[PDB]
């Protein structure tokens with residue numbers, strides 16, 4: 001039962017690269033997985049990886065004593081602006097363990113309670129925007145979610161107000177950031193990056209990094225002009241010592257983590273929120289039940305921390321939006337030693353493996369036959385999901401540090417949304433998923449009718 005591995009078509013020197021020469025590479029990998037099964041080899045010029053789609057292979061991948069986080073090419077290029085921040089550093093880089101030890105406390109339950117007020121502040125700004133639209137007017141979903149989540153990481157993390165709801169155009173940071181990630185996406189499909197032909201692209205990349213470093217500058221400046229102003233994530237970056245050594249972070253690493261958390265703390269959550277709303281409006285029973293639960297639980301003018309915790313059905317909706325379209329759809333791993341996966345595929349020390357999460361999430365042997373159906377009632381019982389069947393937040397010590405932050409935000413927001421408005425899919429919208437690294441619905445528009453429920457000062 002040692003088997004040889006499936007591969008899609010190669011094309012000489014270009015290997016499998018041409019199969020992923022689209023703006024949607026993940027969705028295309030998904031389609032290759034449907035043809036080829038639970039594992040395929042995937043080559044590009046000098047770099048192999050193997051894409052895994054089934055729970056039974058992925059649970060072995062997720063054994064930490066056999067595999068460790070790999071930087072995929074995407075994360076490798078991303079190092080050019082996020083450096084050795086928590087997302088783009090090797091497990092064995094000194095700064096991974098150090099910053100993880102320093103910053104973990106900032107995502108505890110005490111820290112979540114502390115972030116809560118400022119989460120509401122922004123969420124209230126969202127509702128007010130929507131209350132304030134005229135009759136003829138509609139809502140751009142991903143755009144406002146993006147405004148909401150960026151402002152939330154910024155305020156709760158750093159006490160910096162992007163004021164996205166004061167703007168009709170995306171914030172400068174966003175513009176630069178998307179373009180920097182866009183470049184990152186674009187380099188992945190160049191056969192010859194060397195070619196002098198991409199000259200203002202390389203220059204345009206540098207401009208956008210500098211713009212990100214521009215914003216980071218202001219944040220360390222605004223904080224230099226106060227300090228009492230609050231106690232948050234930035235404080236901990238500046239003042240926290242690594243209990244394992246006594247050392248705090250150095251300034252260079254701190255610029256990296258700030259960039260890392262503004263990026264990773266807004267993009268994925270933003271797509272989760274649009275997806276969830278996409279699914280509510282396509283599925284009347286869920287919409288209705290979410291509204292029933294919001295009305296039942298959100299009894300004070302703004303939500304409390306304890307009240308967001310009580311929104312179980314919203315939790316279920318969120319998990320089922322993440323099942324179907326996990327907004328960070330992939331993470332990379334390499335074998336720490338020669339090892340044999342599912343007793344069928346011998347791997348060499350250093351061989352790379354890719355977890356294809358939307359396929360993992362579509363694994364019939366684990367999830368049942370109705371995997372394409374959006375059915376949040378399948379999450380009624382959380383302990384019934386088998387180990388490593390559900391992984392939108394990655395794996396082990398390298399899993400999402402901001403997981404609770406993300407779910408708390410999206411639960412609160414989605415709850416408030418269904419408390420205050422009815423939603424109409426007035427264009428009968430067709431799902432279109434734009435990929436940067438993360439996933440998000442494109443062109444998703446709705447109309448809200450206000451339930452006209454006052455919203456506390």
Ligand code: HEM
Nearest residue numbers: 086087264265268269328331392393394398400401402406
């Ligand atoms: C629902 C939204 C989110 C999703 C689906 C998501 C998903 C993920 C995934 C899949 C990973 C592992 C990546 C890998 O193994 O290469 C990760 C890591 C990480 N996430 Fe998130 N994330 C989300 C939101 C957030 C938020 C709100 C923050 C911060 C406020 C954040 C910060 C991080 C950090 C710092 C890491 C790297 C951890 C380490 O290796 O030490 N993420 N996330």
